[PDB]
Point group: D2
Chain length 354, copies 4
């Protein structure tokens, strides 16, 4: 009745958050710590514990093991936050061996039969696993979570687009360094500097947000998603966790910032109704002070820390446009937290057997 998870890239920056969260989870245990350049070594000795608290005592001494589908008979869930390009073949192997695969990597995010999942936003799309199982002829499956940076905007925008005639969002991000991994960003890129990431990163942000938005079940029907204008300009500075995003949001019809603020405050989905262990009770928190949120003080907010997107500064810009900022914890909600939540969602919908 405890489910046994294998964490690929266990010692990485996303891996350690699977480690930290699961070693407190009521029924999903970090059982198998997969790696590659350090297999054979205790985890406690290779890991870069760039996160809160301490490596759990009962994890510190487990050996890092091979990422090999045929050695994991004992394993029920695979979480896969592996590098682009390597991740897609490994995830496929795993699904072909019968495993359910919850992946934080981009490789599979746009396969039409793979969900791109934000459990509060497009929970119905896990039914794509049925067409996936048939089309690919395998027993297991793959699910992906979006790009941390895309979830920072897609969540408050999902909630908004659900209930208002939102026809554009123009965003700037200032992201922290732990998203790029280790060695990831050279210190000389961000000491006394700001490092923009370029056109391919901006275009990949907007493209993930559009597929999320196109799967939101809406209460109004205008504008079409074809006519919605998105754009992002992204950057990295020297913060360790936490992506801060400034959004100007546009509408087809006059729309009051105070209305939007109430839909954000009260936003909830099936993770809240179902009470999944990792579901924050306010997946969006709204702050009211004109100097918040601040990366350092607000990235660990919520009853489940780091799982809430904290949104602030709602203000009317003109009748048809408002401004807000949102701060997500890029490796908890943006990555490991989100994938946990997804795994709980699939256990409760019977896709992963208990």
């Amino acid at each position: 009745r405890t489910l046994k998870a294998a964490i690929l890239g266990a010692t990485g920056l996303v891996g350690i958050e699977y480690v930290r969260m699961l070693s407190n989870h009521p029924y999903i245990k970090p059982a198998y710590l997969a790696g590659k350049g350090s297999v054979g070594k205790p985890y406690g000795e290779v890991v870069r514990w760039q996160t809160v608290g301490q490596v759990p005592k009962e994890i510190a001494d487990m050996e890092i093991k091979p990422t090999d589908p045929k050695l994991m008979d004992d394993v029920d869930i695979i979480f896969s936050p592996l590098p682009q390009g390597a991740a897609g073949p490994v995830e496929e192997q795993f699904a072909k061996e019968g495993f359910p695969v919850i992946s934080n990597s981009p490789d599979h995010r746009f396969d039409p039969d793979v969900p791109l999942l934000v459990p509060e936003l497009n929970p119905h799309t896990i039914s794509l696993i049925d067409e996936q199982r048939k089309r690919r002829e395998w027993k297991g499956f793959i699910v992906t979570t979006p790009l941390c940076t895309a979830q920072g905007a897609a969540i408050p925008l999902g909630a908004i687009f659900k209930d208002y005639k939102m026809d554009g969002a123009f965003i700037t991000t200032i992201q922290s360094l732990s998203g790029a991994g280790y060695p990831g960003i050279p210190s000389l890129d961000v000491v006394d500097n700001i490092l923009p990431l370029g056109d391919g990163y901006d275009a990949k942000t907007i493209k993930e947000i559009f597929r999320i938005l196109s799967e939101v079940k809406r209460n109004v029907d205008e504008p079409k998603l074809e006519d919605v204008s998105l754009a992002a300009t992204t950057h990295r500075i020297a913060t360790i966790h936490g992506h801060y995003e400034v959004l100007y949001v546009s509408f087809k019809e006059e729309t009051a910032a105070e209305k939007v603020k109430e839909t954000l405050e009260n936003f909830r989905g099936e993770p809240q109704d179902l009470k999944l262990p990792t579901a924050p009770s306010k997946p969006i928190i709204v702050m009211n002070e004109d100097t918040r949120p601040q990366v350092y003080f607000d990235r660990w907010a919520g009853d489940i820390p780091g799982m809430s997107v904290v949104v602030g500064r709602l203000k009317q810009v003109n009748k048809r446009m408002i401004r807000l900022v949102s701060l997500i914890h890029n490796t908890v909600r943006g990555a490991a937290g989100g994938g946990i939540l997804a795994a709980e969602l699939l256990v409760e919908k019977g896709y992963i057997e208990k």
Copy 2:
């Protein structure tokens, strides 16, 4: 035939750029270094030389002197980058004593008879000094330069609004710490954090930009400036100089990013035509690489370093909206450089006598 300048707040962060630039200027000399908490002491011993190179040898040994209009008979130009609230009375005293006053402080920026001057943009408004002299009954005058952060956006927006039906701009800034002075920003506000400045700072940014824009002499006549929507969201991170601003710019009619890019590339005004010593030959530089400009590498650009606004990332967002970023050097163009340029402009229009 050399003009003798007094630099108020000479040892401050803006003062030292008046010092650094003027001690190379062909005919305006840093002659009188005014201070207050350190009067009587050599400049070389109190100054925080938080800028490029070294205190000039021939300045290092001059005494810091009183900020007292009646002791400056020998002085021809006053540059005044004093703190809000103290600056306005001192500047007035100075004008009443017969001095021309070029001020970087906010106190006077919205007196209807005081120019708010960006020499490339609204050069004709120095004629407000005539109505000022009459109304206030004094011999000298006051000129102000805008808020460094407002010039970072007002310049590329001035150039744009001059020639296109620009109906909005939605901006985010990420400003460096030297604008707030010393002690200015507590280290704990920006180490591993981003510090937003709040509603009063955003509203003061947009209000300075609107008065600039309303004084641009335009080649088209739509929309009215009443119907133009501005908004800013401002922040400070741990960079030392350089304010980086992301602008989404909106239009009433279909407008191509490649058109706008040519008007920006070729933008010039009377400072360029007149050849003032401190006028960059491209007051706007356009970079083409999707990871530029970067604060650290581009804040000292241009044939007159730090005087050019470097604008990058021009890209079409939809037919009616484009995105660009601009980087200004907040204490050269945003402050001392700008005020120099203003002083050269007034010497050449005969307002300051040679």
Copy 3:
């Protein structure tokens, strides 16, 4: 039964560690949040929670109250991290009123009848409290704990001095910003810079280390303390918590690094033997990798996190000299954690009573 503690300076950097640690303590409650600037406001809306986790839900809504002894009669214990100069007389009045006062301020640290206490090193000096009550004519008392930066060195030099013929130490500190409070250190002192603190600060570090050393019960008696030579050169850089110190330690005779290392790993005193709730098991943890300790990763070490000094890099320099580094958490061990531990000890010794 429960002791009720008042925390003076409760919203400050050191105050918050009192609130965070006391909120989990089996018997010392944070009952009375004292202040002055923000008296009458909820703690949670004023505090800067620049620490691990979130303000405790039970503390957040508590009103900040006057720092006034005649209003605290239901209070047992007063903890005082007030700024120099202000602390001294406030501590006195509290003592005089009948309270035990545990202070982290420098004011009384050299009164002959006042302990300067690290519970692991000079625990019998608590008996100064009896001459203290009689010559001060009060029923309360004052106890202080040492400057954080003096503790980061004295705890390892205490353990060394107890057992070896130690004749000097020559220390370099690289201290974090939280020790200076907020607004404390200007961000322009330490971005792309290192800030030395100067002679006063080096002299005061050394002077506290000597007082503590003079109170260590030793198992040898060579050399005399008056013949020991201590020096410190101190600095701050842009870390949030944690003070890293390099120590070159000298001896009167051939002394083996491997033996010191072991005397450090085996260090233990009264708090450990009594099992006080805030006593770490290993008040000195010794690390072996030639790249540790690192501030970010080792400052929250120990089974009571922040309470252990972590020491690394033990090495033979020549036969009479060894080198080590140590890392202390400056506001847990260095201030609030050590005051809590002091209060535990006084309870167990019956100096503080239900």
Copy 4:
């Protein structure tokens, strides 16, 4: 007449200081920008100009060329800041071809017949070049300059060792990021952290200091060098240039701090006496304020900026021990500036010839 220099590694951190300094040099021209990764592209579009000022207008359009001796026949002098392991054989081939090679790489720094040169301290070792040509059977030669971090200590300990009975030094370094190149140091090693470099790196610092010390002509002869005790504990933090070192210096007899201080302010050698263009007037500047030097403010010191070691904080620790700090610019003095100065000296001594 003009010497034509090839700069190997010309786009790197140390390379750029060659280009910047050589572009103003009266007689050594940066004629041949060598590389490998970016051969055939303009320098200005590849380089990272992480230094003062802007790429020189004459250098920007120059093609990056092969690092190939048979293509440089018009070249006089080769300067080689190549990475360990790769430098050694490339330097050899250049020598063998007939070039003088001045190297900043560690490869040849311990060859018995190769100088390890700081022109102010062991200038006669240049005469190793004659046995070098004969036993290597080449017409060119190799000369190296020491690790920047070894220079920051050896220049002041050289001046001290020449005149006083110095029996050890015990050093703490706090080094900047540019010494590791780019991508060099991961930003997560040094944001909110300090990175020790470990034993290898401490051993190699000390070992270079000893070789240089062994070559200082002394005016005393106590103690023997083999009896001198050196130690280093080194680290990197998030500054861009400048390596700050604290030195506790030991002596065999009562030695007065005030006298050392003066021997440091009066230090001078051959480069000063010959007036070489890159020789600062005061290769050691001594500062008096108990808060200086500071990396940000004192690393570009001297009438040739970056070429002086700045020393502060001189102080008596006990009668046989003093403390000081020093600040070296690691890629000007510590690498390119010192190679230029070495080349000057060799020209004046006739080792390099028109």
